[PDB]
């Protein structure tokens, strides 16, 4: 059924599941008209599909021309996602199609288990995590390939570098989620924890930094702080 | 008009035939229901007084046959039987008629209550629906699963209503799938209609023979096989106009029909909202939602 805090560890066990989070799909900047109204203009988006064992991320990009003449757009943008999501099933070779897709919204239920009706035994499950996958479009190399794509297409990543050579899949997730979740609440600070030291770079062939282990537990503390941080200043604590 | 004779009712039950109903004591001298109205189907129904579980009944047409009832002391309860012998079966009842031993079935003459509930409702497609091909009457009973309901479990003893489910092959064409679960009208029009129905007369029938079930026998699996029934009109965009007017006639009979107490078990709150308020023909059943909206204002 649902997946929750009970059930954490299945995520990193050895039946294949994939995470789809549907939130950069349809992405609009709201404007004014010469008339005083106000009008939306798409921009690119994506579909964040992640198998959280092996960190590989399967960004499906949006291009605004899927939207051109159709109508209820936040609508079809959770049909579009459950088309894309089902194809890349039938692309994949039988032995590394997902067991279970866990969405990160409820709303993409209905429409990811009608379009796989054909895979009558993949569980599609909703979560009870609150996942930050939203902000996958702060990682530059992302929003990079998103913004720069003239067409549709699909792009490649490992979200978790080289990571899991030194620390496990559990470990991985829980970096990249506590990274995700601090971009979400305040970029800015976030980016500069990250990027500010000169000594330290990003690979070409990786997402982050090159950090070593000692360096990547500073991090995660001032990833932590910026949080509570941040939580203070909302909050008034 | 025709007259089902009872052997005797050694059990005090409650009897219903149609939309009526009567008491009968044990061992009082009731031998039957005379003045049944030819050219509807019928049902005649039971619930034990010491056993209120036991809630049972036949859809039978006199037009098919002699009918007579006798309680079964083995297995408890009240038993259709069909007589092949027709002077015997006319001497035994003008025998009772005489001494005046039969309730009469009590139509009022304005009242069209029954016709509107059985319009299209033909005992060959009740024969279809529940399986005893030995016999030319239909026994239901309150605990008899679906067929739908036996996939998700004797199959000799089941309700062999047409399967619908919005979340399957069937309902949906591949490459369609958002146009398909969001307007059910492939789905209404060419699978059930065209495909398995046939005719939109036999798919009210069988509407209105799951409605007519989930209401005598409190039977859970026909309700919802009345609701789905509902839903899928109510949810495409494209139905012909006579079927929509001819739903708003069917349901407002059964909306007024239904008893006031029972309305809590019988009527579906996420579907009857749905179908009123929200759905393509939110706007096409006038004389159903006037009278759920008089007579059941919680529900909405
Ligand atoms: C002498 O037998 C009976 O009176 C018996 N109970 C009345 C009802 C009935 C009807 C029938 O067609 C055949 C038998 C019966
Ligand atoms: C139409 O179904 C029924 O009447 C069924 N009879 C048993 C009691 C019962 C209770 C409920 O809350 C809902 C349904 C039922």
Request: hydrophobic content about 40%; aromatic content about 12%.
């Amino acid at each position: 059924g649902a997946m929750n805090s009970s059930n954490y560890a299945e995520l990193f066990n050895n039946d294949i599941k994939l995470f789809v989070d549907d939130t950069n799909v349809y992405r609009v900047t709201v404007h004014k008209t010469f008339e005083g109204n106000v009008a939306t203009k798409a921009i690119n988006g994506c579909i964040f599909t992640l198998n959280p064992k092996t960190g590989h991320l399967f960004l499906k990009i949006i291009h605004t021309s899927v939207w051109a003449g159709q109508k209820r757009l936040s609508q079809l943008a959770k049909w579009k996602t459950a088309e894309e999501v089902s194809a890349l099933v039938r692309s994949l070779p039988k032995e590394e199609q997902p067991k279970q897709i866990i969405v990160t919204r409820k709303a993409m239920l209905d429409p990811l288990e009608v379009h796989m009706l054909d895979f009558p035994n993949i569980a599609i499950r909703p979560t009870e995590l609150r996942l930050p996958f939203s902000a996958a479009m702060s990682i530059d190399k992302l929003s990079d390939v998103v913004m720069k794509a003239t067409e549709p297409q699909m792009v490649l990543f490992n979200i978790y570098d080289d990571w899991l050579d030194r620390i496990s899949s559990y470990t991985a997730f829980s970096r990249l989620t506590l990274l995700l979740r601090a971009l979400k609440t305040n970029e800015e600070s976030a980016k500069m924890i990250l990027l500010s030291d000169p000594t330290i770079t990003i690979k070409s062939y990786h997402l982050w930094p090159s950090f070593t282990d000692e360096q990547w537990i500073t991090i995660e503390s001032q990833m932590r702080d910026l949080i509570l941080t941040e939580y203070g200043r909302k909050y008034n604590v | 008009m025709n007259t089902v004779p009872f052997t005797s009712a050694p059990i005090e039950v409650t009897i219903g035939i149609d939309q009526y109903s009567f008491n009968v004591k044990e061992n009082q001298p009731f031998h039957g229901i005379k003045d049944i109205p030819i050219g509807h189907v019928h049902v005649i129904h039971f619930q034990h007084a010491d056993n209120s579980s036991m809630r049972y009944g036949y859809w039978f047409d006199c037009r098919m046959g002699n009918f007579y009832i006798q309680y079964d002391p083995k297995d408890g309860l009240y038993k259709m039987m069909e007589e092949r012998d027709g002077a015997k079966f006319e001497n035994i009842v003008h025998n009772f008629k005489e001494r005046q031993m039969m309730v009469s079935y009590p139509k009022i003459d304005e009242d069209d209550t029954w016709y509107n509930l059985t319009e299209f409702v033909q005992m060959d497609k009740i024969r279809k629906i529940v399986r005893k091909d030995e016999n030319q009457f239909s026994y239901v009973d309150s605990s008899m699963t679906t067929v739908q309901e036996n996939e998700l479990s004797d199959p000799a003893h089941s309700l062999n209503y047409t399967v619908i489910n919005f979340k399957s092959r069937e309902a949906i064409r591949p490459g369609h799938e958002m146009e398909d679960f969001l307007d059910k009208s492939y789905y209404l029009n060419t699978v059930m209609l065209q495909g398995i129905f046939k005719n939109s007369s036999n798919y009210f029938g069988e509407l209105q023979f799951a409605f007519l079930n989930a209401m005598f026998f409190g039977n859970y699996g026909s309700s919802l096989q009345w609701h789905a029934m509902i839903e899928l009109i109510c949810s495409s965009a494209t139905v012909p106009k006579h079927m929509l007017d001819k739903l708003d006639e069917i349901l407002y009979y059964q909306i007024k029909t239904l008893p006031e107490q029972y309305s809590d078990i019988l009527l579906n709150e996420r579907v009857w909202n749905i179908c009123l308020y929200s759905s393509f023909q939110k706007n096409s059943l006038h004389n159903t939602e006037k009278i759920m909206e008089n007579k059941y204002p919680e529900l909405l």
